[model samples]
Target: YPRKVMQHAEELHERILSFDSRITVPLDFGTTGNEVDKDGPGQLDLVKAGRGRLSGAALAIFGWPEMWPHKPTPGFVDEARHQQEIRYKILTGMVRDFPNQVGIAYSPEDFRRLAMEGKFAIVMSMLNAYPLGDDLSQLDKWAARGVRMFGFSYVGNNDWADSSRPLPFFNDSPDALGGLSPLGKQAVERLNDLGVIIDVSQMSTKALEQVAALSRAPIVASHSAPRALVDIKRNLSDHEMQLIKDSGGVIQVVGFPAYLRPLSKPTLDKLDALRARFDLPPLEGLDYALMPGDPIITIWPEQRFGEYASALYGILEEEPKAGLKELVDAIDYTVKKVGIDHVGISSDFNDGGGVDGWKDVSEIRNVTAELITRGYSDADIAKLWGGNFLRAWGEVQKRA
Candidate 1:
């Protein structure tokens, strides 16, 4: 609130974002077709809005198949093709539309150069491997297309691995695959060979362990929360966190409410009451964002999806939805479990990922201020922001 405090925070935020090696990489940054339609090609306007927010060295990941709120897909094959199309379109269109403002980063070196050139870097990642089916070569195809990271599952069992949070609508069980399938094991080797980082954020406990054991390079849980704090399947457990740390990788604490902290029974009851007033369905027990079968997103129209988000976010404004403090707490907890070198920060932004204070990329500095208050040194703050992630990325590539 004071002038000196504000100035110091602003200076620290700017210095970190401007660091050549300090890249702010959000593990999950996405845009639906609806948003792309609304925000112009590659969402250049969104880029403009956050221009000075991250200075020039920040990079955000754009995941393929975006997320569920987009247009429905017919089959895995077509969905894969469609996602590839969008992936190319977004990258090419961004470069073409804003030639000097944005650049697609295929490697860490590319990212640094783009940042040095005063351009924001965009990294491509696959959120779910459902589209790959049995063909492991799709990894090569996607890699060729500039995808630098890959996840084995989204919300259900895939050919590759089991998801931590399987959907009831899909009749998925946590033990469906019992770990990585034979193909998944092979795919792990393939990803390591390809220099693409492996993401274990949405993977089941067994699958994550199996992947961690099999991977030859350091892996990352790109956007996840500490289950010790929030106790959700989607959040990483102590065993899982240990595995990640053991692999010499980073656990990027996610900035999503349900995963950040638990909503009490009273909170649920209050949410239900609020939902009724808004003419929406009750949350019951599910974290709607993680489990996609919620009626709000599945049954409602696109406009109403916005309404549901607004209502839910309104409720979070009360007490449950985590802000910068909770987010930093999760980071602190993770750092204690695993050393500071193995912990980082990420916002599953553009999807259902945002806290109260750091609502979007523009408000990210609030996180820096909170960490600073907690007495995190500038070097440690830089590690949490992006230094650790880039270090793991470099290791994965070096292994390749």
Candidate 2:
């Protein structure tokens, strides 16, 4: 029945478009510009071309300001102003270009109106809160501007929180594993009061726990994997996962190859070999490595999508027999440890993140299909897809 429902939904879209020349495109475009092309036509074209396939997908709009180029060249000052313009341009363009086809998540009224007409729904979220700068007022402003979610940290330190990167010390600095700064606390409080979903994906463990404990609303790890499976600085730890579960939150697993696989000597050797074969340059600074120039470096690495999936499959295929069961086990652990009402799904799709079966948003049904194959009830699959997240979000929004 669930399969029938999913198939029917897919078929409905196909049929609707069969009569019309246009199709829908679900585009989740946003990353530290270092991860994607800042000026590339890829994002714009994707929106324009895939307008049909992307009707109701969530689209996160911005990333860390340092990832973008702005005045005061070296650093990103006046980022709020810059980002505001960019958000307006993007939103206006989307609504104007694909009015009936795209759905935006940030503007609840717009999303509601679109939903009434069966148009696309947009879910606007921020990749990091670094752009909020020192002013909590900007949170309200961005909220008014249709931004609905806020992630606390990005690649490195910020005025508000600590990142997964090691804390850097310079010139007699105090020794610390920095959590949320004072301004960061204020930001969280304001975000909570304003009804923005607080994301704890890239924050330090302490910061995440603090947010879970302090925020009045439920939290989410918009795009992060479980570190318990693969120990990575960027992934969430079990304790952190429990905090999310305890706080009535969800963790969306990302599809990034490096995050899914444990970095090791062998892996590094393989990467190096690929780099040589591709004639890619040596890795540069943290920022450079993250936002490389070459396609192989920037978009696809040697162990790219297929290879990444294979690596995960290999780990699952090991003595423990990982596979889809492993992923379900994670969900089961969190549900049992936290509660079934809190778990949800997020695929870092379109950002070079996909597993073997769950390769893209279009293949989202595969996840539900796998869940059914593994004996999960239809109700469970519903919770995994969007029900649980919507539940948490609704509660959080109601809190404000």
Candidate 3:
């Protein structure tokens, strides 16, 4: 509660948003859709209420696709085309629905300039390669539409790469090696050349490397953590960390509890034991499931986050439990090991990313205060907040 903490935090929070090159998750805007809103189907709030709480001074947003109104096609070819149609519609509607509220950014500079103008900088991304299908030109077409991020998988191989899903499934699995299939490799090359910044989060280490190896542009493990501390396919081992850094990319340390601290049945049991003694309800039905590789959420909301987050971290603030500090420590370790320029922050919030003290964007200033206590200079704080990832994105654009 030092005055300097508040002062420095306010200063940096403003600075974080001011940069044109910065990239931050305004997780709320992507939460509700036309189908899921309280107003009922066929209406879009278009992230009106959500924007009030948006943070990280995002120069742009990845307005991720949620669902397609129609049923799926049995064939990959037609389904993929329909998927592309859905992505294009959601993005165009996002900008169309909120004319003055949001502006689409096609390039890095476009995004930054839009942020300074007090408009939400909306960028687009796909959860998979389904949209691009076999035609790499479609990738180029969408890129022109301001679709910046791409690629994710649930459990099996896609036309592009092997997914690290099905809860820790790996394609190589201790065999000689595995990664992006032949076309998958081609897809990575296409993404790089066309300036579509790739998300290497849910792929095999070999596939991650393969993309890095072939990519002429920088990449992002958009929402991930260091595996040396947490064991999950969603996390990166030191080698993968090094690989990303070597490609001039950054790994955003996600604030999901399972990745933030060690969690197991026994650990959960002990923590619940402590909770019961306080006469509080046990910590159950929390941190239970993860975001499926393919996702469209029902309870996709936050602040909301503070409800489930504090009950656990508030008590564990004294006990050894998952909290903001654990996440900060993981971030610190990542910075020390991989170099500050290669480390960044991400909240899987609205998904499964939140902890006590830093439950939502408004509470993110607490993270700034904690970093100040941990000896981060303003320059370091800037990068950890949004500087590093922006720098990588800048590099990707330049290379393309």
TM-score for each model: 0.80, 0.69, 0.71
Whole-model lDDT per candidate:
0.69, 0.56, 0.60
Cα lDDT tens digits for candidate 1, 1-400:
4566556677876666422111222221235543321333331234533532553322322233433444434454466566546555755576776777777777778877776776666666666777666899988987887778887877666778988876544445656888888999999999999999998988898999999889999999878888777766788878889999999998988787778778867667767786676575766454553334453334556566556566666666565566777888898899999999998777666456778886655566677778888888889988887778778988999998
What clash count goes with each model?
0, 20, 3
Instruction: Give one digit per residue, the lDDT tens place, for model 3 in 18-105.
Output: 2212233333333464331133222123242232223222222332122212112335446555645654565566567666666776
lDDT tens digits by residue: candidate 2, 1-400: 3666556445443432110001112232333431121333332233332423333445554544442212123346465346545755665566666665555664444444565566656677666665666787878887887767778766555667777653221111111335878788888889889998898877878778778878988898877766665665677777888788777777765545455544445434444454555566654322222222233322443345344334433432332112344555555555665666766655555444545654444454555555566666666655665566667777788888
Clash pairs for candidate 1: none
Runs of candidate 2 exceeding 4 Å displacement: 1-55, 65-74, 78-84, 106-116, 166-177, 263-265, 271-333
Worst 10 residues of 1 by lDDT: 20-29
RMSD of each: 5.6, 9.2, 8.8
Show where candidate 1 strays beyond 4 Å.
Answer: 18-52, 55-77, 270-320
Which residue pairs come into collision in candidate 3? Answer: 17-57, 20-112, 160-184
* Candidate 1: Cα lDDT at 67: 35
Candidate 1: C-alpha lDDT: 0.69
